Structure 1
């Protein structure tokens, strides 16, 4: 409950206050999902329940597919522009 909230908050703040590049944005998204899964698995242990672990495995699947789609979209941007500059999207 602590570690997950902390990674989530710090990664949201590093997503919001990133004036540098974009890979930090991808990373902060993945870390936010990680912290969520840790919150949920801690609660699932304390309750001795399974719905939490089910939603966790589902998050892992969905996050991996998220990164796949995001890194195809980036490749499209790069196709057209040739450089992913610090302040472009």
Structure 2
């Protein structure tokens, strides 16, 4: 549970403490979902069931469609502006 908690906490503080660009926010958000998976899949193994793996194979998909949606949101934000700012939106 160490590797999942560490990816979650450190990815979270990498989300919170940026002021430099917009993409570090996206990729820290994506590694938080990885960090939740790393805890869930080991609880599937140690309890001997698939149902944590059921929630895993569902949240893979929701992380995917999340990225598709949110990067179309960014292209909306970029079309009207000229250049995505350093400080943020």
- Normalised-by-shorter TM-score class: over 0.9
The whole-number CA distance in structure 2 between the counterparts of 1:43 and 1:49 is 9
Q: CA deviation at 1:87?
A: 1.2
TM-score (norm 1): 0.97
Gaps in structure 2 of 5+ consecutive residues:
none
Superposed structure 1 runs of 4+ greater than 6 Å apart:
none
Post-superposition CA distance 1:9-58 (Å, at most 9, x none)? 00000100001111100001110000100100001000001110000010
The whole-number CA distance in structure 1 between the counterparts of 2:88 and 2:39 is 33
RMSD of aligned residue pairs (Cα, Å): 0.6
Contact conserved, 2:20 with 2:88, CA < 8 A, in 1? no
Matched positions, count: 89
